């Protein structure tokens, strides 16, 4: 069984670990607990194919820039999670995109664009802009909602699907 080494990168205000816990024990945590180092492995059946999902959560602060670069090489799938309530994370995606290519040296790399906090009425990021931007990058965009649990499971499925596509 192949282990999929994925890294959940994001800024402060998106709630990265919130999605992970939903996949593990299906619990939506409201509190913001700053993670330092944790890896969650689980056996997920992707379209009938059981795969080992190794997802590591990162820090929202750019304090460990060197540490970020370290596992930026090992990370196969990059989760571009931004928040529609935080326009800053939207612009940060451009920075991460370039940084990823800077350590991968490839015009094509398994990546996914997902927007979280889509349950908040305070929308600062336009859905069209997010969709159009996704087309500009050429990656699938999944609307994720941690509160109503929408675009969560399907996001993981599409993720692995793209990885398999790029692979073979």
Ligand X SMILES: CNCc1cnn(-c2ccccc2)c1
Q: Contact positions toward ligand X, by CB under 6 A? A: 5-7, 39, 54, 56, 71, 74-75
CB of residue 61 vs ligand X: minimum separation in angstroms? 18
3-state secondary structure the chain: CCEEEEEEECCCCCCHHHHHHHHHCCCCCCCCCCCCCEEEEEEEEECCEEEEEEEEECCCCHHHHHHHHHHHHHCCEEEEEEECCEHHHHHHHHHHHHHHHHHHCCCCCCEEEEEECCCCCCCCCCHHHHHHHHHHHCCCEEECECCCCECCHHHHHHHHHHHHHHHC
Residue number with CB closer to ligand X (79 or 152): 79
Query: Nearer Cβ to ligand X, position 79 or 84?
Result: 79
Q: Which is nearer to ligand X, 7 or 130 (CB)?
A: 7
Provide, rounded to whole angstroms, the least separation between the CB of residue 19 and ligand X: 15
* Minimal distance, residue 55 CB to ligand X, in Å: 6
Do residues 83 and 14 make contact, with C-beta atoms less than 8 angstroms apart? yes
Of 73 and 165, which has the nearer Cβ to ligand X?
Answer: 73
Closest residue to ligand X: CB criterion: 5
Q: Which is nearer to ligand X, 72 or 130 (CB)?
A: 72
Nearest distance from C-beta of residue 133 to ligand X, angstroms: 25
Among candidates 87, 91, 90, which has minimal Cα distance to 114? 90
Least distance CB 8 / ligand X (angstroms):
9
């Amino acid at each position: 069984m192949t282990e999929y080494k994925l890294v959940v990168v994001g800024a402060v205000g998106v709630g990265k670990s919130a999605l992970t816990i939903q996949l593990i024990q299906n619990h939506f945590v409201d509190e913001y607990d700053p993670t330092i180092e944790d890896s969650y492995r689980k056996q997920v059946v992707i379209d009938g194919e059981t795969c080992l999902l190794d997802i590591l959560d990162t820090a929202g602060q750019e304090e460990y820039s060197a540490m970020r670069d370290q596992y930026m090489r090992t990370g196969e799938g990059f989760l571009c999670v931004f928040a529609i309530n935080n326009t800053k994370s939207f612009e940060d995606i451009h920075h991460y995109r370039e940084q990823i290519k800077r350590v991968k040296d490839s015009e094509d790399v398994p990546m996914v664009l997902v927007g979280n906090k889509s349950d908040l009425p305070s929308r600062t990021v336009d859905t069209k802009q997010a969709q159009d931007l996704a087309r500009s990058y050429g990656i699938p965009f999944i609307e994720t909602s941690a509160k109503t649990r929408q675009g969560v499971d399907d996001a993981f499925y599409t993720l692995v699907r793209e990885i398999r596509k790029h692979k073979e």
